[PDB]
Amino acid sequence: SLAFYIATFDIGTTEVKAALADRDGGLHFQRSIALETYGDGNGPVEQDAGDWYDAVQRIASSWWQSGVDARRVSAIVLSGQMQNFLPLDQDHEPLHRAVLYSDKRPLKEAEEINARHGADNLWSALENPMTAASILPKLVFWRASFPQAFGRLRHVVLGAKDYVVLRLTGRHATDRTNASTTGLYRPKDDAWHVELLADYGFSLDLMPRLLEPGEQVGGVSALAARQTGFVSGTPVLCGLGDAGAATLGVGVLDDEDAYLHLGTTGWLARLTQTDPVGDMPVGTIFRLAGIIAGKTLQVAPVLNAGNILQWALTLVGHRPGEDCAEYFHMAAAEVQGVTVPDGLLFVPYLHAERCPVELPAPRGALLGVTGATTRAQILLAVLEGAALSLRWCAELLGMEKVGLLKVVGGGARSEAWLRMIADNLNVSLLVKPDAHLHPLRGLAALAAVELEWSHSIQDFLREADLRSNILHPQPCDEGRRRRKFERFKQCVETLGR
């Protein structure tokens, strides 16, 4: 017998990652191609969509020339960046650089849309934020500055991997997980928000077809086979946005499962049964459809996360050009055995924030300093403050019944921060290493089911796992931790003046 594979790709924000997955959950022939982002942090956040497909071509070529027979690739499936704005013409050629999720230039457009339609009406329909980063504000902003290119508009691509799927198959599709993020999809109707699009003069023909992640979009076309070396006719599945694929990949499959991404920025998520949406949150919350039938992933994006720990290295002597490794080591060593006084509190909003509070300007402060305060207490207070912000997100997400948080990202290298999170959220934590592979694992599992390699995603993932210790919360004076948390919320409000 010879090995057969699922080709998995993640068209990420900074690189395209890929692997050939076997039925036992192994990820072979791993590849990474870096992507360039344009805008220099000055407002635009943009990429050339052709670079995404160029990466896929380079990857596939590297597989065939490493001895892989493309006929043994039984399916291709992708995840990638969500909440993109990429306008294409009738030849599927870009009319502008793809605009990434973190670009929030269209503030006035979002304000106008919320005013015209009613912020509460939109939240009820979309179950997801309508902000400057949303796709309708970006499409209106683009039409206004580029009317000639707008006249050539035929397709609006909403997620990076959907552009690659279009190049491979000739068909425009997207998954409902990504669709949720855009502010254009109505989860309870399972349809694009027709009357919102029509009000702004946009035809539904611009939008991709909604497909389930395991559904086949089409086979690789003859042209795409010439361009990539994949066998024409190989099934290309729709796949799903990277948040969905990554959470699946670590086994976030059941009600009250939960996930925390601790990168430079991060996000906290709770999977739960789909329910009617409540009142508009103060604090941004996404409700992502489509990852698991009958369930919704509630997500709180956090713009102050690992970057807070990185900032704090200044206190141990880090300077702008220097390598950080030794300073992280020092900071970790300095907080061992230390306790934060109840009165010392660090409000960690060094950058604008979305959750748990909408803050367009920083609100960073160290409060309660006395002559007894030590630098070590301050460094630990910084981790505590970051954890208290996460506790507030957890409250907004309704995470009282969550038993275990799966944790990923470079922030999890801080053992002291993990202790602060477990104790303050009163939740057990399991760190899942090698985060760049998690979406590929999720994609492999969902494709394995469609190929009849496995009966379910759960079966596939558990077998792959047969190839670590949970961190549990310390008993606390619950009341005492709660009171500090309530003080934290009071201080955040008061600092707003």
Ligand X SMILES: O=C(CO)[C@@H](O)[C@H](O)CO
Q: Summarize as ranges the residues that interact with ligand X (CB under 6 A).
A: 82-83, 101, 181, 243, 267, 286, 299, 301
> 3-state DSSP: the chain helix, strand, coil percent, rounded to 5?
40, 20, 40
Q: Looking at this protein, which amino acid is placed at residue 15?
A: E
Shortest distance, position 243 Cβ to ligand X, whole Å: 4
Instruction: Determine whether the annotation assigns residue 264 to a binding site.
Output: yes
DSSP 8-state code for residue 281 = P
Residue among 39, 218, 398, 410 that touches ligand ADP (CB under 6 A)? 410
Q: 224 vs 253, which CB is nearer to ligand X?
A: 253
Distance (Å) of CA 109 to CA 12, 120, 144, 187, 355: 27, 17, 10, 23, 22
Is residue 306 part of an annotated ligand binding site?
A: yes
C-beta closer to ligand X: residue 128 or 169: 128
3-state SS record for 394-433: HHHHCHHHCCEEEEECHHHHCHHHHHHHHHHHCCEEEECC
**Is residue 413 annotated as involved in ligand binding?**
yes
Only one of the segments 163-171, 182-190, 213-221, 404-412 lies at the binding site for ligand ADP (rule: CB under 6 A); that segment is 404-412
Would you call 141 exposed, middle or buried from its count of C-beta atoms within 10 A (0-12, 13-18, 19+)? buried
Q: Give which of 137, 135, 279 is closest to 208, Cα–Cα.
A: 135
Residue 386's CB is within 10 A of a number of other CB atoms, namely 27
| 241 touches ligand ADP by CB under 6 A | no
Integer Cα distance of 35 and 134 in angstroms = 23
249 to 268: interface string for ligand ADP, x by CB under 6 A = --------------xxx---
For residue 310, state whether it binds ligand ADP (rule: CB under 6 A): yes
Binding-site partner at residue 286 among ligand ADP, ligand X, none, CB < 5 to 8 Å by type:
ligand X
Q: Which of 12, 183, 306, 439 binds ligand ADP (CB under 6 A)?
A: 306
CB nearer to ligand X: give 7 or 303: 303
CB of 230 to ligand X, least distance (A): 29
Query: Got the DSSP string for 164-191?
Result: HHHHHHS--EE-HHHHHHTT-EETTTTE
By beta-carbon proximity to ligand X, the closer residue of 59 and 268 is 268
Contacting residues for 442 by C-beta, under 8 A, at least 6 apart: 79, 244, 245, 246, 247, 248, 249, 250, 457
Is 328 annotated for ligand binding? Answer: yes
Residue 65 among known ligand-binding residues = no
The entry of ligand X, ligand ADP, none near residue 182 (CB within 5 to 8 angstroms by kind) is none
Q: Which of ligand ADP, ligand X, none does residue 243 bind to, with CB < 5 to 8 Å depending on kind?
A: ligand X
Among 143, 154, 413, 489, binds ligand ADP (CB under 6 A): 413
| Token pair 């970051």: residue | 386
Nearer to ligand ADP (CB atom), residue 282 or residue 324: 324
The dihedrals phi and psi of 284, each to the nearest 5 degrees, come to: -75, 135
| 310 annotated to a ligand binding site | yes
181 binds, among ligand ADP, ligand X, none (CB under 5 to 8 A by kind): ligand X
HEC sequence for 187-233: CCCCEECHHHHHHCCCCHHHCCEECCCCCEEEECCHHHHHHHCCCCC
Q: Is 409 in the site for ligand ADP (CB under 6 A)?
A: yes
The listed partner (ligand X, ligand ADP, none) that binds 47, CB under 5 to 8 Å by sort, is none
330 touches ligand ADP (CB under 6 A): no
Residue type, 155: H
Q: What is the size of the binding site for ligand ADP (CB under 6 A)?
A: 13
Q: Which does 298 bind (CB under 5 to 8 A by kind): ligand X, ligand ADP, none?
A: none
Select 283 or 306, whichever has its Cβ closest to ligand ADP: 306
Question: Pick from ligand ADP, ligand X, none: which does 310 bind, CB < 5 to 8 A by kind?
Answer: ligand ADP
Q: What is the largest CA-CA distance in the chain?
A: 74
Amino acid at 93: E
309 lies in the site for ligand ADP, by CB under 6 A: yes
What angle (nearest 5°) sits at the alpha carbon of residue 464, between those of residues 82 and 243? 10
List the beta bridge partners of residue 46.
38, 99
Q: Which residues are annotated as a binding site for ADP?
A: 264, 306, 310, 328, 410, 413
Applying CB under 6 A, the residues found at the interface with ligand ADP are: 263-265, 306-307, 309-310, 328, 409-411, 413-414
Q: Which residues are annotated as a binding site?
A: 264, 306, 310, 328, 410, 413
